[PDB]
């Protein structure tokens, strides 16, 4: 049963009455489900996977694009010399879990291998009907509210040897992060997280990094080499507001104690480079009151500096930007096939 491609039925238990846009969108675009999976193991079956070549990711991307476009309307948008203006009311915004259901005559496959790196053969394959609920969190650098690795930390790449390929780190243990625009400079914000917890996280990631690239290698984290503020900082949407957080303090570390919490300084911006398409959008000023989100860091997206030239050293920087890698981080274990 080879991999095939066809339009999918998304899924959500989203409530009809919740005026929040994800619930509102999911009710009109998605189906209730399940009511059951309900069970489908495939004995003695080995299957090759490729999370990096999965039509599901591209299709999902289109669903989340449509959601934002329908839900978070900018006052002004500029794309390809063309200008759009529209009403831009503030909304309630909080990613609900989303499932993705295969249509008739088709079925979904799940990789259950413990070490599974996202490419190549899987020995613990199983079928189903829908992937478990994915929160469509839009962010760079850090993966939020995702699913954790079952055993050890896992890192995945389309080509580890290709420095142009994004490295997806999946943590097996969450690090809580608290971001706030305090009540009563209305665009100034910050995030707090445990310094010690993060150091341990970096350490364990670094350990897996040494395992992949060579134990003779020295592992270094460095800040963004530059670009749009969206990828220089850890950015995310909280409560309809666009947060841009300085992650310098998160990504300055070497092998060779100060402070209980790490505090990242942040800004709320009205003017953003869009992730859905190339362009800029202006939104209305931030809402009043306390703005706060508590999220699980469940993974990371890294890129690695090439080189050479001296070698023996590997430098890693925070990355992201292409949200397809975000969806891939959850859909990596799945593929769609046609029953024949």
């Amino acid at each position: 049963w080879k991999e095939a491609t066809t339009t999918l039925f998304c899924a959500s238990d989203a409530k009809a009455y919740d005026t929040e846009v994800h619930n509102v969108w999911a009710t009109h675009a998605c189906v209730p489900t399940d009511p059951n999976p309900q069970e489908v193991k495939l004995e003695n079956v080995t299957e090759n996977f490729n999370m990096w070549k999965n039509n599901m990711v591209e299709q999902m991307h289109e669903d989340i694009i449509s959601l934002w476009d329908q839900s978070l309307k900018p006052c002004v948008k500029l794309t390809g010399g063309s200008v759009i203006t529209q009403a831009c009311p503030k909304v309630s915004f909080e990613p609900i879990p989303i499932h993705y259901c295969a249509p008739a005559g088709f079925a979904i496959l799940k990789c259950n291998d413990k070490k599974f790196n996202g490419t190549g053969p899987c020995t613990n394959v199983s079928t189903v009907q829908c992937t478990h609920g994915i929160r469509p969190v839009v962010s760079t650098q850090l993966l939020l509210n995702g699913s954790l690795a079952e055993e050890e930390i896992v890192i995945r790449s389309e080509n580890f040897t290709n420095n142009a390929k994004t490295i997806i780190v999946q943590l097996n243990e969450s690090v809580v992060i608290n971001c706030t625009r305090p009540n009563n400079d209305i665009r100034q914000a910050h995030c707090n997280l445990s310094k010690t917890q993060w150091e341990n996280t970096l350490e364990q990631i670094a350990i897996k990094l040494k395992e992949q690239f060579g134990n003779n290698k020295t592992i270094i984290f460095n800040p963004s080499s530059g670009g749009d503020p969206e990828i220089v900082t850890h950015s995310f949407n909280c409560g309809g507001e666009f947060f841009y957080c300085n992650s310098t303090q998160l990504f300055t570390w070497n092998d060779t104690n100060t402070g209980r919490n790490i505090t990242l300084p942040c800004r709320i911006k009205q003017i953003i480079n869009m992730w859905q398409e190339v362009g800029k959008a202006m939104y209305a000023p931030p809402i009043r009151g306390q703005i706060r989100c508590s999220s699980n860091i469940t993974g990371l997206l890294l890129t690695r500096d090439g080189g050479k030239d001296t070698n023996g050293t590997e430098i890693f920087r925070p990355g992201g930007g292409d949200m397809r890698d975000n969806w891939r981080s959850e859909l990596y274990k799945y593929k769609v096939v046609k029953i024949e």
């Binding site: 963004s224 080499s225 530059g226 670009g227 990828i231 480079n273 992730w275 398409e277 190339v278 397809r324």
Partner: peptide, 27 residues
């Protein structure tokens, strides 16, 4: 992404530019 202007911006930091989805990234 606008790759040309991305490239036009990064070099001024000493760097090459490339797209990260719809965003400009310096290398």
């Amino acid at each position: 992404x606008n790759l040309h202007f991305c490239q036009l911006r990064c070099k001024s930091l000493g760097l090459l530019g490339r797209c990260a989805x719809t965003y400009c990234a310096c290398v």
